[model samples]
Target: MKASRLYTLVLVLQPQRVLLGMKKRGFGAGRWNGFGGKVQEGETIEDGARRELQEESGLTVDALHKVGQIVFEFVGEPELMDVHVFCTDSIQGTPVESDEMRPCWFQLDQIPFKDMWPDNSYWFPLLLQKKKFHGYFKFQGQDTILDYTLREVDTV
Candidate 1:
C-alpha cells in the first residue's frame, strides 16, 4: 500500500469552543475544520503536527496531547494515509494569515459540516470527549464519501 502521513489538532480556546481552520486549498477548501497538514520528510508526526499548526495559523501549541491515530485506505493511486490526531488546551501567540488557512472558532454544536470533509462530523464529537479511536474512511471522490467505520478504544 502507498503510504502518506497527516497530522491534526483539535484546539479548545473556550468552554465548548474549538479552534478550527478554514482551509483554502486541496481536499477541504472553504470549510471550517481543525488545523493540520501533511508530514514532511525526516519529520516526526508530532513535529509535523506542531509545525503545520504554527505555519498555517501562526499559533504555537502550549500543551499538545496526542489522542489517537487512524489509517485510511482509499481506492486509488495514493492508497493509504496515516492520520494523527491531537488536542491542545492552550497555545502561545496569536493567529496570523497563512497560505493554507484562516483561523476560526466554532461552538461544538455549530460546526459547519456541510463544507467539511464528510468524515469529520462522524468522528469529531468523540474526539472532543477525549476518546481515543481508530478508523477507516473511503472517499470515492473529492466530495463523495463511499463508506466509513470507526471504533473507540480508550477514553481520556
Candidate 2:
C-alpha cells in the first residue's frame, strides 16, 4: 500500500436538513455527496473544506465542526484516501449550482443513500446525531464496500 492522500468532506447541516451535491463529473460523478475535495498543499484541512464548499455550492460555512475521519482503500489500488469529515449548520449564502455540482437539500429522514457511497449508510446516522467517529472502508470498486469498521469516538 502507498501513503494515504488527504481530502476533505463537508456537510452543511440545517435543522432537520442537510445539503448534498450531485457530482456532475469526475471521480464520484452521479453520486450524491458532501462538498469537498483534496487538501491543497498550503491550506489547512478546514480551509480546504470551506473552499471546496464555496466553489461547489456557493455556500460559506461560518464554523465547521470536525465530526469524523474515514480512511478508504480499494482492492487493486495502491493509493488510499484519508478523508477529514466536517459539518456545519452556520453558513452564509444560498446554494447554487456550479460546473462541478448540482446542489440540493434533503430532510434528515429522506437522505438519498441509494445515490451515495455505500459506506455512507453505516456512518451518516452518527453524523446526524452529532457524534464523532473514525472509520475504515475497503472497497471492491467504486460502488461496493467490501469490508469496513466504524466506531464512535470521544472527539474527531
Candidate 3:
C-alpha cells in the first residue's frame, strides 16, 4: 500500500457561509470546494494546511483548529487525508484565483452540490453541524464513491 496525505481547511465566512475554491481542472472540474493540498516530505499536517491555504487563497488564517481526518482506498493506492477543518474570524488579504482554484464563497445552504463531488453533499452537513469528524472513503473516481464511514469527534 502507498501512503499519501492531504491537509484541508473548511473555511467558513460570516452569516453561515463557506469558502469553496473553484477547481479549474482535474477531478471536480468547475466545481467549488474547500482549500487544501497534499502534504510534502518532512512537513506536518498543520503546517501543510497553513501553507496550502495561504498559497491557494492568498490569505493568512489568524487561528486554525484541527477537526478531523479521513482515510480512503483507491484502486492502486491507499490515501490518508488528514483533514484540518478550521474556522477563522479573520483573514489578511483578498482572495485570488490560481492555477488550481477560483476563489469564491457560497452560503452553507446554497452550496452547488450538483457540481461537487458526490461525497461532499453527504458529509458537509456534519461540518455545518459544527461537529468534528474522521472517516474512510472508497472511490473509483471523482464522481464515483464506492463506500464511506465517519464518526464525530468531540473535543472542546
Per-model RMSD to reference: 2.5, 1.2, 2.4
lDDT of 1 by residue, 1-156 (tens): 366656555554456777878877886478776777788888877778888788778888755677777666666748477788877778667777678788877777787778776787777777777677887788776667677788888752
Report the alpha-carbon TM-score of model 3 versus the true structure.
0.83
Rank the models by lDDT, top first.
2, 1, 3
Q: Sort the predicted structures by TM-score, highest score first.
A: 2, 1, 3
Better of 1 and 3 by lDDT: 1
Task: Please identify model 2 stretches exceeding 4 Å from their true place.
Answer: none
Candidate 3 ranges beyond 4 A from true positions: 26-28, 78-82
Top lDDT hit: 2
Q: Candidate 1, TM-score vs. the true structure? A: 0.84
> Considering TM-score, which of the candidate structures 2 and 3 is the better prediction for this target?
2
Per-candidate local distance difference test = 0.73, 0.91, 0.71
What clash pairs does model 2 have? Answer: none
Question: Model 2 over residues 1-156: C-alpha lDDT tens digits?
Answer: 379999999999888899999989887689999988999999899999989888888988766889999999999888899999999889878999978899999998899999998999999999988899999999997888888999999978
lDDT of 3 by residue, 1-156 (tens): 566566666565555677778888876678677787776778776777778888888877756676666666666555555555665546777788888789887876788888776667766777677677777778886667788887887862
